[PDB]
Nucleic acid binder design. Structure first.
Lengths: 705, 686, 249
RNA sequence: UCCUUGCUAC
RNA sequence: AGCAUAAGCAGGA
């Protein structure tokens, strides 16, 4: 007898048997070794999609520049994806866009955008993902790379007094006008760098391999920018964020389920006696190699035509930084002999000199990228990689969906980052061929290439949008990630309540039927108990932590008031996912047990739930044996100074500490201020006031010298 | 020098304090004179007054001060007596009148400026407006004036006559949209314009003076004509052909352990003897290894003598009750020691003429065929095993009169099916064995340990533990998330081997076992393999495979009441069929319907297989089978779907099927789904 | 006498040579980017390194002088609780945590614990005193809203709260004085009749103020009435294919 | 030129 | 040998 698990779909829908088709209970595939060939494929595939050879020499950079707009060599293979934008066509689409809703549309959204830019502090740049530090040329979090940037500013020329967005951006442009920039290398020596090399280094974007992407066969290279591109990109993402929040054909901020009901219901009420509707799910292919920033420069020159003089030149800098970006090409490749015994390593630097030790695909991809290679980097000038403008291309999609040709056959739909749903209304099937080929015509001219392999359609609503397969009436939910239930891993107190918070937030947002909630609650309970080696008292587990509990169980009177981390049973349920375990169980604890656990005179905690099991595990051992020991000394110094600033201002972690003078002078003036206020209504003693005054003056003469 | 012009009539302390305030504000020069006039005039107000007063005088001078502290002392006085400001800061603090005092100085008429600040704050604070020309329009209450006013208009006449003698009138003005126009950036922005433009100025003016035309549609239709793209229907050209399963050598058994061919020795579980090395010892006395004699000539395989000496060495190692293999040639050959290339950096290379000619070359992955053994392990894996509970689950919480009973009922019923199957035995095998291997890989790098391969289950109520094999670690120095350390697995089986299925094994013989219903054979298997850090993290938590399964089942049940609006759950899990398992000789409308509850058994099986055989091929194949499921749902309701390019689609599906047995198996069952659905709907082939 | 200690600490930290180049060279706001210098990348596997942490014998850093006042070096059968390896902080085992929890001293602090967490005990007190009924098994579903989800009686909008704690806890560096103060300054008098003398630290005090004044308004799919009391009853009352509500009071 | 060692409880 | 899949691990200081 054979067996087939797909047969349940013979009398069901694709809204119930579709979570069965996700391999989300297994490990995601990771990358191995160097990531050079993927970056070569991306850049060389972009130049293959350039559709031109019109090169222009450069005076700033020592490499040639290929153009990407209005220079087309029309091949006969037009179904192949193109990367060439017609600017008069897309500006005609923008003029066609603003004539649909309002008159002062871009002026209103630009005034709200600049209204939010002027009240923004630059410490928001530290609340982000990883960035690229060009000082040591590695990947670091945002606060570390920002503080190394400000360290290079205050080390090179002068100090920093900005504390705003605009003065920091103007500080970066002033760094572009500088002839020599000095920073620190490693054991902290001080090195220098010129002017053109600082331009070559400020526009370097580091590529690596995308790890853990469910749904692809071949891997892909993700890119991370530096620090001097992040505030300008934040400005553009605020502008396009307000533009996408004002529109009615986008789904990035999110409701994504009411909009499709209003456009299916609203466009099914606009049919004639013989017309009908066909929807098409598509997928825009090669989305990161066909979005050129020059069309972003033209459109962002068109949006802010009447905004200001600050915003008009402030929203026209990040596309200019995207037209001349460098690309790190990984870390090279490896060669070996015939016996596979000794394997030398060739880095990204000496790849030109060791060119004749490569493969056929490595030399094919390498000779099509050779006249654009720098020593370490490459000069891509038309690409828009991952980790960049994502709310601005959706506006291009809404511009493709708002085309008007003048019958009464047209289209509408909904746009995402690279997933569209197109609704067509027409009368006959060759007219459907005409309208769909007109949609491929307008998207093909503007620079959006629909994939002919991953697109289909039906007459009623049976479409697909952001992995939610919508049937004719019902809605399936997103197949969520499984390991996100247990990723706290910090404490015996902030794991199970964090797990109930994750189960609660996945219950409110997604469907998450109650049997799955109780089952995932019990499995997270079991992984909690298996993690921290704590079992209930009536079990037969005899380890080094259940011997004390089993020995001392006679002292506890009420046995079901113990905590789960102390060998208690379960009292939380589906209707208790918002109350923590300790606060639910403090109505039943013994007073010796409750007064013994919750004692703040404990050797573990001293030096959002109740902190009574909160311990800190020990640190590592190889953090003080490599060459990066002194940096850990520097974070020790930073924690000391932050402890002093905590010792001066008693309420500083509540409000954001703005100010632009210094830290120590606010300390000294604050100790003098509270020394006078606590002097005249308080102290009164000459030796104390004279001794504190003597220590402030001696510390000030010590600090100034 | 404007400073020396000032110091002829400006005070000496106001240089340092007022210049310090200008250093607080920014980089300006006329604000030195502005804070000089305002602050010096406020010093003239507080010059000779307060003959007799309280401990603190009548006037308090805090306008010219370090700009952090007028608010704080304003809070010490306004918090002492009880007052409240009105979004404004005051010049001189008065306590005789219990109000504020704010002074403005202008060159224009004193009417308009009082309408400005009075238009701002009204009659809340006290406003006094002064003029160099001698105008005065201020608030209605007054004080002890015509003494301070005479000297302050005398001083404004003095400095005003100094400005008449020095001609500085436009420089004496009291109180954003500029970007720093740099040099290399304007040379960069004009370089990165589109090709029909010269500078950014011409592009900005043409974008500011743009109107559209009707040459748009001519370019659009001119893009329509040179296209050659037709859509492909399905009711007339139903070319949904079955997929290309490779007709090559059969795909082997690639799982790390043995599922269907396992054999376990049992003993009652001791609570004191619970560590894995103690379970290893108590099964060395329990399962008699003195009768575990092996011949040095295997049935088939690759390496015979090294596994014989390795099994003898680990057998005398377990015999001496310590788990540490002393270094011999067998372990130095099997678990990789010294088998790594010499990673030489590019600082010394010492090139030789035509000697050590080095290059690189990559190959890819080889292709295999349809596995025939997978159906018997599917039907074996969902069959009930008498050993009962395998999975270490947890306790059930108490319930209110809410919906919780329903949830509890579902969980209890589903757990009552899934604890007895053999998939629970394999999940317990992976959890205990790979968990013990995980703790051994943390605690002892650089040392080869011995980890048993075992389970724990309840036999007739008596809690017992099993023993399925002997695992050997490979001195895992887990630096990164990769590393792929070498595990040497000695397995226990009781069936005759197969060179098609057990292709990677090195099957020896073990002996005889009495099996009561007579005394059958016993085959010991050998296999070297590898693990990593990530598969240790994911395999040791396979209990989460229980999480989606019930969800799927519960959706069906909920949709039933979503069509009926009546509490039919207990009888609906009994009087409902579910189609599975068509036969082999015929397929067409010959399906086996089972109960809805037993279906969950089959479902946990495929979830467990998604834990094992996850590769790239299963990911891409799951995307493309979601596409074909959308096509089949488009067939089920007669919606007349259509496609634009089928050929490259089948080149991607037939691209992403190479060697995974689950991917080839689900491809075959997808083709058989196309046959059974082809018996009713017309969009497919045979 | 705290200003003498702060003078000894400020003079102690200005004694260092290369530490003087740190302060009086940055800004006040740079403290924020002085707070975060996490040189680790992401701590990408917390539960993995936590299970690797708990598998050892002494994973925990614990204080010496508090634990040696009452604790015992080894338990009654081979259970290790102490080390001598290393500031004077000594490694330990979680068997000393549960040994502290069962064989240690106790200090009565139930009033402070039952006064810091008044919102959560209010959640349990409102949860215990409700009544349920039968289910419905019907189709249900509606859009996403912005709903205040806490039964507070003050209803501030996250702007008078930070300013309020500046004008309650520490007014010496509080804020520029706004017009939002007046009636809330009478409320400042009422709060200064409460938070004057307590053993509660100012970070915990500023924590516990912000849970009785802040209606947490979120963007959640709601259906039926939009009462703020039944918003922890959002996920318990109904899902997508079922509904249970019979609340009388 | 050299091979230091962490003590495992579903 | 093996894990693995377009390139790495199978010690290093």
């Amino acid at each position: 007898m054979e067996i087939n698990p797909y047969l349940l779909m013979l009398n069901n829908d694709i809204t119930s048997m579709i979570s069965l088709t996700y391999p989300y209970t297994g490990a995601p595939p990771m990358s191995h070794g160097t990531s050079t060939k993927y970056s070569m494929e991306t850049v060389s595939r972009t130049y293959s999609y350039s559709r031109t050879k019109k090169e222009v020499p450069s005076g700033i950079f020592p490499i040639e520049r290929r153009k990407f707009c209005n220079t087309i060599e029309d091949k006969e293979n037009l179904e192949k994806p193109n990367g060439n934008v017609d600017i008069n066509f897309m500006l005609s689409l923008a003029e066609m866009l603003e004539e649909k809703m309002g008159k002062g549309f871009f002026k209103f959204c630009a005034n709200e955008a600049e209204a939010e830019i002027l009240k923004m502090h630059f410490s928001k740049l530290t609340e982000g993902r990883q960035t690229y530090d060009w000082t040591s040329e590695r990947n670091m979090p945002a606060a570390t790379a920002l503080q190394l940037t400000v360290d290079a500013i205050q080390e090179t020329q002068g100090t920093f007094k900005g504390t705003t967005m605009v003065e920091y951006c103007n500080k970066i442009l002033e760094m572009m006008d500088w002839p020599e920039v000095k920073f620190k290398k490693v054991t902290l020596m001080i090195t220098k760098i010129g002017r053109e090399e600082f331009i070559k280094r400020i526009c370097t974007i580091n590529t690596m391999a995308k790890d853990g992407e469910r749904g692809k066969y071949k891997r892909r290279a993700i890119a991370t920018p530096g620090m001097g591109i992040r505030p300008f990109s934040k400005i553009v993402e605020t502008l396009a964020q307000k533009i996408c929040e004002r529109l009615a054909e986008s789904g990035l901020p999110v409701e994504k389920k009411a909009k499709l009901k209003t456009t299916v219901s609203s466009t099914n009420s606009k049919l004639q006696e013989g017309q009908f509707m066909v929807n098409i799910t598509g997928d825009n292919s090669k989305w990161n190699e066909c979005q050129q920033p020059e069309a972003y420069l033209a459109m962002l020159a068109y949006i802010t035509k009447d905004s200001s003089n600050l915003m008009k030149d402030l929203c026209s800098v990040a596309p200019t930084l995207f037209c001349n970006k460098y690309v790190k090409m990984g870390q090279g490749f490896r060669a070996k002999n015939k016996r596979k015994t000794k394997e030398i390593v060739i880095p990204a630097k000496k790849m030109k000199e060791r060119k004749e030790l490569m493969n056929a695909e490595w030399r094919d991809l390498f000779e099509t990228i050779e006249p654009y290679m720098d020593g370490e980097c490459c000069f891509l000038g038309g690409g828009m990689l991952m980790g960049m403008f994502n709310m601005l291309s959706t506006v291009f999609g809404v511009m493709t969906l708002n085309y008007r040709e003048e019958r009464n056959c047209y289209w509408t739909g909904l746009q995402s980052s690279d997933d569209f749903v197109l609704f067509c209304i027409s009368r006959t099937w060759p007219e459907m061929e005409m309208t769909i080929l007109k949609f491929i015509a307008v998207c093909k001219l503007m620079g959006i290439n629909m994939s002919l392999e991953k697109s289909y359609g039906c007459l009623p609503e049976l479409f697909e949008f952001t992995s939610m397969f919508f049937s004719g009436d019902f809605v399936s939910n997103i197949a969520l990630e499984l390991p996100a239930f247990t990723t706290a891993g910090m404490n015996e107190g902030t794991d199970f309540t964090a797990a109930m918070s994750v189960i609660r937030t996945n219950m409110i947002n997604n469907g998450l039927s109650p049997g799955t909630a109780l089952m995932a609650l019990r499995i997270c309970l079991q992984e909690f108990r298996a993690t921290y080696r704590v079992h209930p008292y009536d079990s037969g587990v005899k380890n080094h932590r259940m011997k004390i509990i089993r020995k001392f169980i006679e002292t506890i009177e009420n046995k079901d008031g113990l905590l789960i981390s102390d060998g208690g049973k379960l009292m939380n349920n589906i209707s208790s996912l918002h109350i923590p375990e300790e606060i639910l169980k403090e109505d039943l604890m013994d007073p010796s047990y409750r007064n013994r656990v919750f004692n703040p005179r404990n050797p573990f905690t001293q030096f959002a739930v109740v902190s009574t099991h909160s311990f800190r595990t020990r640190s590592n051992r190889t953090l003080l044996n490599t060459d990066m020991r002194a940096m850990a000394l520097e974070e020790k110094r930073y924690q000391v100074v932050c402890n002093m600033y905590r010792s001066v201002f008693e309420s500083a972690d509540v409000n954001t500490p703005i100010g632009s003078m210094s830290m120590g002078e606010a300390i000294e003036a604050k100790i003098l201020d509270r020394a006078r206020t606590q002097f005249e209504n308080g102290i009164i003693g000459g030796e104390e006031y004279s001794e504190i005054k003597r220590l402030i003056e001696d510390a000030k003469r010590q600090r100034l010298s | 020098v404007i400073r020396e012009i000032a110091k002829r009539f400006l005070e000496q302390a106001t240089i340092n304090i007022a210049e310090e305030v200008v250093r607080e504000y920014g980089d300006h020069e006329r604000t030195m004179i502005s804070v000089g006039v305002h602050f010096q005039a406020c010093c003239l107000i507080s010059d000779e007054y307060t003959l007799e007063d309280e401990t603190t005088p009548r006037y308090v001078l805090l306008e010219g001060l370090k700009r952090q502290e007028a608010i704080s002392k304003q809070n010490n006085i306004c918090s002492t007596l009880g007052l409240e400001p009105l979004r404004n800061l005051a010049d001189i603090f008065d306590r005789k009148t219990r109000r504020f005092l704010e002074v403005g100085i202008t060159k224009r008429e004193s009417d308009e400026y009082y309408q400005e600040k009075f238009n701002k704050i009204g009659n809340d604070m006290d406003i006094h407006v002064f003029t160099y020309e001698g105008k005065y329009f201020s608030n209605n209450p007054n004080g002890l004036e015509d003494i301070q006013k005479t000297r302050i208009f005398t001083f404004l006449s003095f400095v005003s006559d100094e400005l008449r003698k020095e001609n500085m009138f436009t420089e004496m003005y009291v109180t954003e949209l500029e970007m720093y126009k740099s040099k290399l950036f304007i040379a960069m922005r004009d370089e990165s314009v589109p090709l029909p433009y010269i500078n950014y100025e011409h592009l900005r003016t043409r974008c500011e003076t743009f109107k559209r035309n009707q040459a748009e549609c001519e370019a659009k239709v001119a893009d329509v004509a040179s296209r050659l793209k037709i859509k492909l229907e399905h009711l007339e050209e139903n070319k949904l052909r079955p997929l290309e399963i490779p007709k090559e050598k059969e795909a082997p058994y690639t799982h790390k352990f043995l599922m269907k061919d396992a054999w376990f020795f049992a003993k009652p579980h001791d609570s004191e003897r619970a560590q894995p090395q103690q379970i290893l010892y108590d099964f060395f006395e329990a399962a008699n290894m003195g009768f575990m004699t092996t011949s040095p000539k295997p049935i088939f395989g690759k390496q015979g003598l090294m596994y014989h000496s390795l099994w003898g060495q680990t057998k005398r190692a377990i015999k001496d009750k310590r788990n540490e293999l002393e270094p011999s040639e067998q372990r130095d050959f099997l678990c990789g020691i010294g088998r790594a290339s010499k990673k030489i950096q590019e600082d010394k290379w010492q090139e030789s003429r035509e000697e050590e000619f080095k290059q690189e070359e990559t190959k890819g992955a080889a292709k295999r065929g349809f596995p025939t053994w997978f159906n018997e392990e599917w039907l074996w894996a969902m069959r009930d095993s008498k050993i009962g509970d395998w999975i270490p689950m947890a306790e059930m919480p108490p319930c209110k009169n809410e919906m919780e009973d329903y949830a509890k009922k579902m969980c209890e019923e589903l757990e009552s099916k899934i604890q007895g199957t053999n998939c629970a035995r394999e999940m317990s095998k992976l959890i205990h064995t790979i968990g013990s291997l995980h703790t051994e890989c943390r605690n002892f790098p650089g040392k080869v340990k011995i980890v048993p391969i075992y389970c724990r289950g309840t036999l007739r109520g008596e809690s017992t533990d099993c023993l399925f094999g002997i695992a050997i670690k490979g001195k895992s120095h887990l630096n990164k998330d990769d590393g792929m350390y070498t595990v040497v697995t000695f397995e226990f089986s009781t069936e005759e081997p197969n060179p098609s299925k057990h292709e990677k094994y090195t099957v020896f013989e073990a002996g005889t076992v009495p099996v009561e219903a007579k005394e059958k054979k016993l085959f010991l298997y050998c296999r070297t393999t590898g693990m990593s850090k990530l598969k240790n993290d994911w395999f040791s938590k396979c209990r989460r495979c229980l999480i989606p399964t019930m969800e799927t089942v519960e959706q069906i049940v909920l949709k039933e009441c979503a069509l009926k609006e009546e509490n039919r759950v207990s009888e609906m899990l009994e009087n409902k069929r579910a189609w599975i398992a068509h036969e082999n000789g015929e397929n067409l409308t010959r399906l086996v319907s089972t109960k809805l509850k037993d279906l969950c058994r089959m479902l946990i099986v495929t979830q467990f297989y998604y834990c094992i055989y996850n590769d790239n091929q299963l990911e891409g194949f799951c995307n493309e089978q979601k596409k074909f499921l959308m096509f089949l749902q488009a067939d089920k309701d007669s919606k007349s779907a259509f496609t634009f390019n089928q050929k490259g689609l089948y080149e991607k599906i037939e691209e992403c099927i190479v060697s995974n047995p689950l991917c080839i198996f689900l491809a075959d069952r997808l083709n058989k789904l196309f046959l059974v659905a082809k018996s009713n709907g017309a969009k497919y082939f045979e | 006498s705290l200003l003498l200690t702060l003078a000894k600490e400020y003079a102690n930290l200005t004694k260092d040579k290369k530490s003087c180049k740190l302060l009086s060279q940055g800004t006040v706001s740079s403290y924020t980017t002085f707070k975060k210098w996490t040189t680790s990348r992401k701590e990408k596997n917390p539960s993995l390194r936590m299970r690797w942490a708990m598998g050892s014998k002494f994973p925990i850093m614990a204080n010496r002088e508090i634990l040696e006042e009452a604790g015992i070096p080894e338990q009654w059968e081979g259970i290790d609780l102490w080390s001598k390896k290393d500031l004077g902080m000594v490694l330990a085992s979680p068997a000393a945590i549960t040994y502290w929890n069962f064989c240690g001293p106790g200090v009565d602090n139930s009033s402070v614990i039952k006064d810091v967490y008044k919102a959560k005990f209010m959640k349990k007190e409102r949860w215990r005193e409700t009544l349920w009924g039968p289910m419905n098994f019907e189709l249900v579903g509606k859009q996403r809203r912005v709903v205040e989800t806490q039964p507070v009686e003050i209803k501030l909008n996250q702007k008078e709260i930070k300013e309020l704690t500046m004008w309650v806890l520490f007014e010496d560096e509080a804020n520029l004085a706004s017009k939002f103060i007046q009636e809330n300054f009478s409320l400042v008098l009422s709060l200064r009749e409460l938070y004057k003398g307590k053993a509660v630290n100012k970070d915990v005090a500023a924590f516990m103020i912000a849970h009785q004044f802040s209606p947490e308004k979120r963007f959640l799919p709601t259906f039926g009435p939009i009462r703020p009391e039944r918003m922890e009853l959002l996920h318990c009352l109904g899902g997508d294919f079922w509904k249970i509500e019979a609340v009388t009071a």
